[PDB]
């Protein structure tokens, strides 16, 4: 098992692919999607 | 308006001498982005132990910029 070994790298890549899917879902939560703020919260009560 | 106090009453301003050759000294100092020289936070929000890409006013990497150096006035003996 080493960086040179292709088979060991494939095992690491499979774990990385699972990690990438989790990271993307969390990143989408971070995205405003054009909202003024990530959470409406304050504008619901303090504003109209 | 705010008061800056009395303006100087001197009849004549001090004489100024400009010599190009004396000020012709080159010491280039390019901006180092890796050293984070001249860096201002774009949104003024701190981040801890993380790396991100952000858009803000920033100096060009490896920019020598404009160098201005102040110099002592001509003086003879102990009198400026």
């Amino acid at each position: 098992f080493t960086t040179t070994n292709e088979a060991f790298q494939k095992v690491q890549d499979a774990v990385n692919n699972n990690a990438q899917a989790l990271s993307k879902l969390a990143s989408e939560l971070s995205n405003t999607f054009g909202a003024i703020s990530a959470s409406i919260g304050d504008i619901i009560q303090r504003l109209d | 308006y705010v008061d800056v106090g009395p303006d100087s009453v001197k009849s004549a301003c001090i004489e100024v001498d400009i010599q190009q050759t004396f000020f012709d000294k080159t010491w280039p100092r390019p901006i180092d982005v890796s050293k984070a020289d001249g860096i201002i936070y774009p949104q003024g929000r701190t981040y801890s132990n993380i790396t991100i890409t952000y858009q803000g006013l920033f100096p060009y990497q490896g920019d020598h910029g404009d160098m201005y150096v102040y110099s002592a006035g001509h003086a003879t003996g102990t009198t400026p």
């Binding site: 703020s37 959470s39 409406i40 919260g41 304050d42 504008i43 303090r46 | 981040y47 801890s48």
Partner: protein, 36 residues
Amino acid sequence: ANDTKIASQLGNCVEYSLYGVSGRGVFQNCTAVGVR
């Protein structure tokens, strides 16, 4: 009031409106990190 203070509701899921920023997050005391 007491509810607004972070120390009173530490360890509890809470809605934060600090500085016009709104979110639902638990507040837990920890070591200082980032620029004060």
